[PDB]
Amino acid sequence: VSQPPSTQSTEATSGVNSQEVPALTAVETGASGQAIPSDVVETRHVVNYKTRSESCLESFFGRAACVTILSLTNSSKSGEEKKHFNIWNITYTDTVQLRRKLEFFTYSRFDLEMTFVFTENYPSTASGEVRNQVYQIMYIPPGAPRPSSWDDYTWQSSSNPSIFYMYGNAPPRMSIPYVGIANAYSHFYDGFARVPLEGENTDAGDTFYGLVSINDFGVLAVRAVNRSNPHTIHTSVRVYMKPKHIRCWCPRPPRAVLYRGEGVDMISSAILPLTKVDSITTF
């Protein structure tokens, strides 16, 4: 049995008239302000039991956030074969909620919990019959051969980790180790994938700059394993990521404006975070 650390309690204090001035400081030093109630006013004694138990990075990142929505269609019509499967690039930039949070830190390190939610429906009036669907999520790491058709040899997965879902069952989920090839996950990257030497374009680099130019986690090749039926059916698969067993370094300000692309990039369309206030003296 143990007692979680509580937030500073307030010890009772009173007047003062010393040469000790906790009120004044010099933030030029780079040090934040330190004063607390006791230093400025007369306080009473207060026993604080409350804890920052929920601001613990593990709690703050303890949610299965949706990262992307993939679509695919099992159809029996002419050009509906390439539709019989889909390939998603692993990343959290597809959305903005989770992304922003992680984006609070320069580097991070964690294990990952993938959770998948499937939702199928009928497109046109082809509201007929179709047996139950069995999907396959295949993780194709960088370097592994990718599926040509919704059914070429690649879906054997003799080495690639694959899930097999039977629509209607509990949302398949699985865990992934910290796989980064670095000592930590890099969230930003003020560099280029390679060094452009003396005799090259006076623009070289514009193609390979940014974290995006060096990061690569492979892709998720989803598909329905059933064959094509009379009526066409459409499925939407949603990817959920929850970074667990985490720890991060170097805090940075939150993304204040809309996100453009995978990089920092802003759009002149929306770069006014704040809001006009009547007057500087308007409560």
């Binding site: 670095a182 003020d190 003396e198 005799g199 623009d203 514009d206 300000p253 453009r260 770069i271």
Partner: protein
């Protein structure tokens, strides 16, 4: 003490020495000091090259000028030193390089001036490109200015057409050219040179990365940014000007992977 003022301070590295009679303490980034790679944290197996004094000294960049119009400035480590004496040579002759630095921003005025520079040292300082026609579109040449470094502006005008204006950072001051309110740039190691208080800024910074040692010629760990949180001002003219000088000194530098020298694209 014998009057050991928090204001007066001396710094020495190699054969270089800074002094300052009006500083406001000094800060040590994230509370850690520069260190070398420990046998338990090492990666490259070749015996490293540790330049010591030959490269771990005080290199002074070409001063810039603070005007009532000035919007801000920026630089990149190790970039803004790639040409600094011996440090550079080592930096370029080696594939992998590691280093921390002591940043000393100088800027004296007079008891009759006003002004406040926010000197921030941001790790992994990635800025947005100036062209909404592409993403992460910045040329190596433009990303790595060197001793000159860049400057911040207060306007954002992307060149979706002119592809030679897109390949450069969109140094938007009120957003750090990152898309984050500069008002919170303080969550980074920093100091503020408020003219009525100090005239120097000293920030010691340790290597920072998701790796022990990295490839300097491709990656700039730190980024130095200076924004006038308080506009320069002088009772006399309505066009006052004061010099701002930046002197950087690398520390605990070590390199691995020696070969022929690296010479990047240039104009």
């Amino acid at each position: 003490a014998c009057g050991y003022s928090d204001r007066v301070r001396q710094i020495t590295l190699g054969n270089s020495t800074i002094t300052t009679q009006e500083a406001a303490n000094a800060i040590v980034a994230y509370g850690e000091w520069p260190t070398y790679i420990n046998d338990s944290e090492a990666n490259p197996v070749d015996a490293p090259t540790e330049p010591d004094v030959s490269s771990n000294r005080f290199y002074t960049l070409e001063s810039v000028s603070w005007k009532t119009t000035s919007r801000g400035w920026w630089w990149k480590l190790p970039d803004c030193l790639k040409d600094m004496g011996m440090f550079g040579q080592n930096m370029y002759y080696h594939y992998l390089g590691r280093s921390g630095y002591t940043i000393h921003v100088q800027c004296n005025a007079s008891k009759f001036h006003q002004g406040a520079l926010g000197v921030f040292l941001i790790p992994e300082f990635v800025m947005a490109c100036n062209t909404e026609s592409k993403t992460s579109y910045v040329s190596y040449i433009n990303a790595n200015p060197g001793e000159r470094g860049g400057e911040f502006t207060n306007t954002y005008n992307p060149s979706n057409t002119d592809a030679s204006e897109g390949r450069k950072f969109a140094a938007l001051d009120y957003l750090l050219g990152s898309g984050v309110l500069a008002g919170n740039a303080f969550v980074y190691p920093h100091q503020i040179i408020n003219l009525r208080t100090n005239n120097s800024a000293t920030i010691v910074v340790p290597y920072v990365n998701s790796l022990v040692i990295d490839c300097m010629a491709k990656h700039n760990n730190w980024g130095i940014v200076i924004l006038p949180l308080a506009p320069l001002a002088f009772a006399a003219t309505s066009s006052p000007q004061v010099p701002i000088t930046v002197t950087i000194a690398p520390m605990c530098t070590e390199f691995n992977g020696l070969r022929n020298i690296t010479v990047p694209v240039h104009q």
